[PDB]
Write an enzyme that holds these catalytic residues in place. Structure first.
Site, short mmCIF file in Angstrom:
data_model
loop_
_atom_site.label_atom_id
_atom_site.label_comp_id
_atom_site.label_asym_id
_atom_site.label_seq_id
_atom_site.Cartn_x
_atom_site.Cartn_y
_atom_site.Cartn_z
N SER A 149 45.03 31.55 45.31
CA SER A 149 43.88 30.77 44.88
C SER A 149 42.62 31.61 44.99
O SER A 149 42.20 31.97 46.09
CB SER A 149 43.75 29.50 45.72
OG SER A 149 43.06 29.77 46.92
N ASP A 150 42.05 31.94 43.83
CA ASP A 150 40.85 32.76 43.65
C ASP A 150 40.87 34.06 44.44
O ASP A 150 39.82 34.65 44.70
CB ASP A 150 39.58 31.92 43.94
CG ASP A 150 39.16 31.88 45.42
OD1 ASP A 150 39.78 32.48 46.31
OD2 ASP A 150 38.15 31.21 45.69
N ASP A 151 42.06 34.54 44.79
CA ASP A 151 42.21 35.82 45.46
C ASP A 151 43.39 36.55 44.83
O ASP A 151 44.48 35.98 44.71
CB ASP A 151 42.43 35.64 46.96
CG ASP A 151 41.66 36.65 47.77
OD1 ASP A 151 41.45 37.77 47.27
OD2 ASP A 151 41.26 36.32 48.90
#
Length: 135
Positions: A86-88
RNA sequence: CUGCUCCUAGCAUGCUACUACCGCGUAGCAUUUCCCAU
């Protein structure tokens, strides 16, 4: 009050939504990077033909074209590997291609974010590693 | 709020092993009783 937008935190699908958003950002940055390169100094025909086909299937064809989608997806798998949370995310990409600007690069991400999210991602925050012994 | 892990307790199930008794089934061995009128 009234929330103008942006994802919440107490829901149950924030993580998957952010993952899909990240994949979309990376793919569109790759598409932007490929199509802003002069075709008169391109390497072996294959990529130049692929770019021509891409522009046609993007702005001239009306409906979807499946085979070109499969081919471009395979190309991305060939020269762009992503590991997504998630967003990484962490990316392993061929470097000689990126030298000629035929795949993504940090400047492309800066431009995509600037015109699509209204935020200026300063490049001092990113990290780029050439070695693969250390992770 | 999602995912991962630890620990504890309980339950329940499955499987394995051990112990006892039972009867069965089989085999062996051996014995005990020995019968009568209308």
């Amino acid at each position: 009050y009234v929330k103008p937008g942006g994802t919440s935190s107490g829901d149950a699908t924030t993580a998957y939504a952010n993952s899909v958003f990240n994949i979309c950002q990376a793919v569109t940055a790759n598409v932007n990077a490929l199509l802003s390169t002069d075709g008169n100094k391109i390497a072996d025909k294959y990529v130049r033909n692929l770019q021509h086909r891409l522009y046609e299937c993007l702005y001239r064809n009306r409906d979807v074209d499946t085979d070109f989608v499969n081919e471009f997806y395979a190309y991305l798998r060939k020269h762009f590997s992503m590991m997504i949370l998630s967003d990484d995310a962490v990316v392993c990409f061929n470097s000689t291609y990126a030298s000629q600007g035929l795949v993504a690069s940090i400047k492309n991400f800066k431009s995509v974010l600037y015109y699509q999210n209204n935020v200026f991602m300063s490049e001092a925050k990113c990290w780029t590693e050439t070695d693969l012994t250390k992770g």
